Amino acid sequence: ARSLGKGSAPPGPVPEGSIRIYSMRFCPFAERTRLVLKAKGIRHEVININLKNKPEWFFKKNPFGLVPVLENSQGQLIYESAITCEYLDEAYPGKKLLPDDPYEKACQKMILELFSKVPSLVGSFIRKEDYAGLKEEFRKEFTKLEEVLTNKKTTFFGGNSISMIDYLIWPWFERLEAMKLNECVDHTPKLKLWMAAMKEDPTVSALLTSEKDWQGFLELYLQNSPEACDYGL
Amino acid sequence: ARSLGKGSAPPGPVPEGSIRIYSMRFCPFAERTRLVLKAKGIRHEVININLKNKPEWFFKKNPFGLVPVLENSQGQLIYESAITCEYLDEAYPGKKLLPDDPYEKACQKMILELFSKVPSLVGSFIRSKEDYAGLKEEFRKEFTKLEEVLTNKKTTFFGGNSISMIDYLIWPWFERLEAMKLNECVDHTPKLKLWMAAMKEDPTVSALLTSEKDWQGFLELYLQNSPEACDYG
Ligand SMILES: *CCC(=O)Nc1nc(-c2ccc(Cl)cc2)cs1
Numbered sequence: 037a038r039s040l041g042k043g044s045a046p047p048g049p050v051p052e053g054s055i056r057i058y059s060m061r062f063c064p065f066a067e068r069t070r071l072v073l074k075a076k077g078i079r080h081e082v083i084n085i086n087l088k089n090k091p092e093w094f095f096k097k098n099p100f101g102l103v104p105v106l107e108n109s110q111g112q113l114i115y116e117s118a119i120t121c122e123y124l125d126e127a128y129p130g131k132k133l134l135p136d137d138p139y140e141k142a143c144q145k146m147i148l149e150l151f152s153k154v155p156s157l158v159g160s161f162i163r164k165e166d167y168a169g170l171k172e173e174f175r176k177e178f179t180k181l182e183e184v185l186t187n188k189k190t191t192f193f194g195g196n197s198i199s200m201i202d203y204l205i206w207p208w209f210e211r212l213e214a215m216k217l218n219e220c221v222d223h224t225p226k227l228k229l230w231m232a233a234m235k236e237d238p239t240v241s242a243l244l245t246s247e248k249d250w251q252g253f254l255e256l257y258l259q260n261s262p263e264a265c266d267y268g269l
Numbered sequence: 270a271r272s273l274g275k276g277s278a279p280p281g282p283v284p285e286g287s288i289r290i291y292s293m294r295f296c297p298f299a300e301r302t303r304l305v306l307k308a309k310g311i312r313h314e315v316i317n318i319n320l321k322n323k324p325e326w327f328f329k330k331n332p333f334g335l336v337p338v339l340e341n342s343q344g345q346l347i348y349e350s351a352i353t354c355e356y357l358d359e360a361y362p363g364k365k366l367l368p369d370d371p372y373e374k375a376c377q378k379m380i381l382e383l384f385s386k387v388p389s390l391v392g393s394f395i396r397s398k399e400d401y402a403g404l405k406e407e408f409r410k411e412f413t414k415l416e417e418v419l420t421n422k423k424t425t426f427f428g429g430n431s432i433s434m435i436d437y438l439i440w441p442w443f444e445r446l447e448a449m450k451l452n453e454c455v456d457h458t459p460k461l462k463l464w465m466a467a468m469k470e471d472p473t474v475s476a477l478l479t480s481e482k483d484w485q486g487f488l489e490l491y492l493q494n495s496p497e498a499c500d501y502g
């Protein structure tokens with residue numbers, strides 16, 4: 037679980053019948069891929085990377101130097117959290133997380149765009165007097181997502197059952213309580229109900245983080261510490 | 270072909286067995302969608318929107334108020350140029366522009382991300398100074414990343430030795446380099462210069478090409494923030 041940083045040895049080849057994920061323990065982007073891997077029951081190894089102290093060999097896995105990164109037996113590398121999720125869904129057996137229908141698949145991708153502003157807002161909130169403006173920005177963004185669910189007349193962003201789009205947007209909502217931003221969903225009833233539905237899901241439940249671990253990581257994030265991603269063990 | 274602006278009547282229903290594209294004659298993003306429609310031989314109607322004088326009804330077609338927008342007989346709306354292009358490839362018969370292989374499809378999407386900085390740079394160059402030297406240097410940095418792709422690929426196009434989705438997706442910005450007087454920005458990228466020449470030889474690219482006179486006419490009006498710019502001719 038302890039992250040690999042500068043000076044760490046690169047890992048060996050990926051064994052046949054397995055896939056590797058270069059992750060970061062509290063990273064919401066890497067969490068997307070981890071939620072898909074669990075949901076689809078794919079056999080995999082996790083290698084945690086310290087992005088605040090990146091090993092030199094990791095630059096060869098991804099030019100952007102970001103996690104998640106998938107690596108297979110054939111040495112093929114896949115990066116960008118949405119791209120890895122789609123790859124896994126297409127490349128592995130089981131129930132498809134993404135709908136077969138081209139228009140419905142397009143909708144999920146269109147909903148993902150409606151969400152695109154939330155990760156950057158979250159980042160700005162982690163990095164003075166302007167917590168007030170960011171809270172007002174969150175509400176504006178959440179209202180758009182609520183309008184989706186309202187028009188859809190379903191519990192999830194892709195129907196009355198869970199799908200890819202739910203797993204993609206979930207990690208940021210999972211962190212609202214820890215960021216002390218629960219008031220930002222007070223005007224969005226369907227979105228509050230969706231968050232409750234998510235926590236009941238076995239895949240979401242398995243990959244959940246405690247408030248103590250969330251607060252611990254945040255304190256170290258606010259101090260721009262490289263040791264932040266190794267909070268606890 | 271004359272664009273619809275403020276005060277124009279919204280168009281009638283889309284006839285069965287046809288799709289509609291809300292475009293803008295010199296828009297590189299809507300050109301992506303128009304290149305796919307031509308390449309796949311899809312039956313469609315084009316409705317040009319003046320984005321510098323948007324009709325009030327257009328916001329009902331897209332909340333982002335941007336082109337391209339696809340509309341079908343069932344009144345289904347698809348926006349985001351990449352999303353429209355993938356929808357068309359999946360929803361219509363013929364040769365697939367996107368490869369069936371999950372990893373190869375992922376690569377196209379990974380290359381698309383390596384290109385993501387170019388559209389914004391192009392935009393900054395059009396809206397104005399010594400800032401022109403800095404933008405030229407930024408273009409070179411970006412183009413070098415694309416040259417590294419072609420070098421490693423050891424193929425003519427970004428998705429093999431044949432034209433595919435990824436070429437059509439990045440092509441409109443390179444098509445405008447000559448008109449923007451930015452040919453010197455590809456001097457250090459030989460494989461990319463060869464790729465641009467290969468693109469111009471493609472029948473789909475050739476069919477949708479624009480003259481230097483039309484390019485310059487539109488640009489002059491774009492620099493003057495004229496609403497009449499997209500109706501140059
Ligand atoms: C992949 C590294 C990365 O982008 N990490 C980030 N962590 C957050 C975060 C984590 C915990 C909480 Cl409570 C809020 C935000 C955002 S980006």
Ligand SMILES: *CCC(=O)Nc1nc(-c2ccc(Cl)cc2)cs1
Nearest residue numbers: 293295296297336445448449484
């Ligand atoms: C969809 C409207 C839009 O984004 N239009 C744009 N036009 C350009 C442009 C057009 C011609 C030339 Cl020569 C350069 C740039 C960029 S975005």
